[PDB]
């Protein structure tokens, strides 16, 4: 329950720590194509997911809600080369409905994210 509160409502739903600083000043804009590696888990550590388990960069369009809200918020704060940890309350992840079978109701999630690169499509 440590980290910078990076939510808009300042409700501590998404807590962020920079583990490795990136390069430059620039962070990605909404609509940028983003390339990451990540490892992620449920706080109840019975499900761990990883891009490394394919060794393939995970790619998505930032701010489009193609991923959980906490990602769109979180990756937008990141500099290229940055590694960050996000602790995520259910309101910014899968909420009260969850996403069975992977995600139970009201789950807290953790991710380690490396931002590799972003480009304007
Ligand atoms: C609920 O469905 C999934 C959720 C995730 C994982 C997850 O929650 N995400 C995957 C990495 C991006 C953030 C977040 C998420 O938005 O996933 C939904 C998702 C999966 N692929 N996509 C692409 C279409 C962009 C979105 C969890 C993390 C905790 C440990 C268990 C898995 C990976 C998945 O497979 C890669 C999922 O299945 C499609």
Swiss-Prot record:
UniProt domain PPIase FKBP-type: residue ranges: 23-111
Span of the entire protein shown here: 20 to 140 of 457
Ubl conjugation keyword on record: yes
Subunit structure: Part of a heteromultimeric cytoplasmic complex with HSP90AA1, HSPA1A/HSPA1B and steroid receptors. Upon ligand binding dissociates from the complex and FKBP4 takes its place. Interacts with functionally mature heterooligomeric progesterone receptor complexes along with HSP90 and TEBP. Interacts with NR3C1. Interacts with Akt/AKT1 and PHLPP1; enhancing dephosphorylation and subsequent activation of Akt/AKT1. Interacts with IFI44L; this interaction modulates the kinase activity of IKBKB and IKBKE. Interacts with IKBKB and IKBKE.
Keyword Protease: no
Protein name: Peptidyl-prolyl cis-trans isomerase FKBP5
Major subcellular location class: cytoplasm
Compartment list: Cytoplasm; Nucleus
Tissues in which the UniProt entry reports expression: Widely expressed, enriched in testis compared to other tissues.
Function: Immunophilin protein with PPIase and co-chaperone activities. Component of unligated steroid receptors heterocomplexes through interaction with heat-shock protein 90 (HSP90). Plays a role in the intracellular trafficking of heterooligomeric forms of steroid hormone receptors maintaining the complex into the cytoplasm when unliganded. Acts as a regulator of Akt/AKT1 activity by promoting the interaction between Akt/AKT1 and PHLPP1, thereby enhancing dephosphorylation and subsequent activation of Akt/AKT1.
Keywords tagged on the record: Acetylation, Chaperone, Cytoplasm, Isomerase, Nucleus, Phosphoprotein, Repeat, Rotamase, TPR repeat, Ubl conjugation
Organism: Homo sapiens
GO MF annotation list: FK506 binding; heat shock protein binding; peptidyl-prolyl cis-trans isomerase activity; protein-macromolecule adaptor activity
Stated induction or repression of this protein's expression: By androgen.
Residues modified to N6-acetyllysine: 9
PTM comment, free text: Acetylation impairs ability to promote interaction between Akt/AKT1 and PHLPP1. Deacetylation by SIRT7 promotes interaction between Akt/AKT1 and PHLPP1, leading to suppress Akt/AKT1 activation.
One of the protein's GO biological processes: response to alcohol
GO (cellular component) term, any one: nucleoplasm
